[PDB]
């Protein structure tokens, strides 16, 4: 299987409710662990683009897999859970 071949995503696809959620600019955490969070969605995310989680932590889109996005979390992964909403910032990771 694959990361996005999970039962929840399959249910969302078959039920036809894949229209309300903004998969183009936001995403939901599939699996957070080992300091790398897999995100389903963010179809318009860029490589190395900084994405901010629901809790407030910010992450860098390292791996852009065909079905998911591997985001490294700049903080403690305890604050990130499965189902958390990840939204783009529209910018490669930068610093003031």
């Amino acid at each position: 299987t694959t990361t996005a071949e999970v039962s929840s995503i399959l249910e969302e696809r078959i039920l036809g409710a894949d229209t309300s959620v903004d998969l183009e600019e936001t995403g939901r955490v599939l699996s957070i662990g080992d300091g790398i969070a897999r995100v389903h969605g963010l179809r318009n995310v860029q490589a190395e683009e900084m994405v901010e989680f629901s809790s407030g932590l910010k992450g860098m889109s390292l791996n852009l897999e065909p079905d998911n996005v591997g985001v490294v979390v700049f903080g403690n992964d305890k604050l990130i859970k499965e189902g958390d909403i990840v939204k783009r910032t529209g910018a490669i990771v930068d610093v003031p």
Binding site: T3, V6, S7, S8, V29, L30, S31, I32, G33, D34, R38, N76, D77, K78, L79, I80, K81, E82, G83
Partner: protein, 465 residues
């Protein structure tokens, strides 16, 4: 409430329906005689979280319901935890009834913020002449207690607890990571005899947190955090100069490596966990000096393969602020405590921290001891008449110094019948300075053996002849 879907080894996977618990959350398994606490470590997806167990996983059936506590492992904390033995999950294991306290605290807490950190190094006076003179303990620092058995390590621990309780009015916590059950019981009864822990009234000074070797690696990985939380309560809610003990840090590193290996994570060099540095930092950074108080950790260290360059001792030394080594040769010489005056080092042994006078006195003492080592080599090879008068006087002064480093202990009064002494730092510095100045060169060598302040040394000299 989730259900167990995998019981592979000590790794238990629980699938939840309504709400997935966050990482580092305590899950309590239902249907077991003894509490089985699962700590969430990963979110595997499909509403499944992979957890490590704090107890044996036998008898677990796929489908057993597990309740999310809603927080990390919370332990009973407060003044009533003194004189009690509690495991990682906080249950009392001294068979003295429940530990009745007012509040509980999660073991997993963030390190104090940058502003909360103190900006001034300060010496924690332990009342021991050798420690306070040559290898002072920084307040909120970490101490690497080298040496094992036969050098009175446990006596030193008890005396440190008693001195810190009497001088600074701060309690102490002993967190035994991977401690032998027999040695745990022996230490418990030895502390009971020493009086640092009392079973009658609430005058105990030590809160024991024992993670035995027969417990799963997850338990030994969090016993240190449990003891550190017990110390954090005293530091924050009471503003005391707490004293934390970890015996030993190497078993904490080993437990972390085992836990990481159980989770199928590719090991780092010399078979250690990838998160060795980060786990060690998360454990150690909570041992610091906040504005309310401070926590000072005296961590025993075992060097694997006697290699100081191994990843575990190197990572541990990265956080140490001082080292105290108990040499068996010094114990055979008859000097108690057996702290080696030369091999023991302190990072704060700097004029800008301890003052010019203290630094000069300590440096002079160490130089005289090294010269004594050289002259002892010469005496071993050549004859004692070969060395000059200056060499003989240096030998005499160094012998007086190394016998003055010996000190009676209050925790050992019942055994040896010699009253214990809590020597202040000023008295130690003044006595050693006067000894170096040759003021007491006429006194005999035994005049300085097993005494407190130098006034007791001159009194003992008067007692002799």
């Amino acid at each position: 409430t989730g259900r167990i879907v995998a019981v592979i080894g000590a790794v238990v996977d629980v699938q939840f329906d309504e709400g997935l618990p966050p990482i580092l959350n305590a899950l309590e398994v239902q249907g077991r005689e003894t509490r089985l606490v699962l700590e969430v470590a990963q979110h595997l997806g499909e509403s499944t979280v992979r957890t490590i167990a704090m107890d044996g996983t036998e008898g677990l059936v796929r489908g057993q319901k597990v309740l999310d506590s809603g927080a990390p492992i919370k332990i009973p904390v407060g003044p009533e935890t003194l004189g009690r033995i509690m495991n990682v999950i906080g249950e009392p294991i001294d068979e003295r009834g429940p530990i009745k306290t007012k509040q509980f605290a999660a073991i997993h807490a963030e390190a104090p913020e940058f502003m909360e950190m103190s900006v001034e190094q300060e010496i924690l006076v332990t009342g021991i002449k050798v420690v306070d003179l040559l290898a002072p303990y920084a307040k909120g620092g970490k101490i690497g207690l080298f040496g094992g058995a036969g050098v009175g390590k446990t006596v030193l621990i008890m005396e440190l607890i008693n001195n810190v309780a009497k001088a600074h009015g701060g309690y102490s916590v002993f967190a035994g990571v991977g401690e032998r059950t027999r040695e745990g019981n022996d230490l418990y009864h030895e502390m009971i005899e020493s009086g640092v822990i009392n079973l009658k009234d609430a005058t105990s000074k030590v809160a024991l947190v024992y993670g035995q070797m027969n417990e799963p690696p997850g338990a030994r990985a969090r016993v240190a955090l449990t003891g550190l939380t017990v110390a954090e309560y005293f530091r924050d809610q009471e503003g005391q100069d707490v004293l934390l003990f970890i015996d030993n840090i190497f078993r904490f590193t080993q437990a972390g490596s085992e836990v990481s290996a159980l989770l199928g994570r590719i090991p780092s060099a010399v078979g250690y966990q990838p998160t060795l540095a980060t786990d060690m930092g998360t454990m150690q950074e909570r041992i610091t000096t906040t504005k309310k108080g401070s926590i000072t950790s005296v961590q025993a260290i075992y060097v694997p393969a006697d290699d100081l360059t191994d990843p575990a001792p190197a990572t541990t030394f990265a956080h140490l602020d001082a080292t105290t080594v108990l040499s068996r040769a010094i114990a055979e010489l008859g000097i108690y405590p057996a702290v080696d005056p030369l091999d023991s080092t302190s990072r704060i042994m700097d004029p800008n921290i301890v003052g010019s006078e203290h630094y000069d006195v300590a440096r002079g003492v160490q130089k005289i001891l090294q010269d004594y080592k050289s002259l002892q080599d010469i005496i071993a090879i050549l004859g004692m008449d070969e060395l000059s008068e200056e060499d003989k006087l240096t030998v005499s002064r160094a012998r007086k110094i190394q016998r003055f480093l010996s000190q009676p202990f209050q925790v050992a009064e019942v055994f040896t019948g010699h009253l214990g002494k809590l020597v202040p730092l000023k008295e130690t510095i003044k006595g050693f300075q006067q000894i170096l100045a040759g003021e007491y060169d006429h006194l005999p060598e035994q005049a300085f053996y097993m005494v407190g302040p130098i006034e007791e040394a001159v009194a003992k000299a008067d007692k002799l002849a």
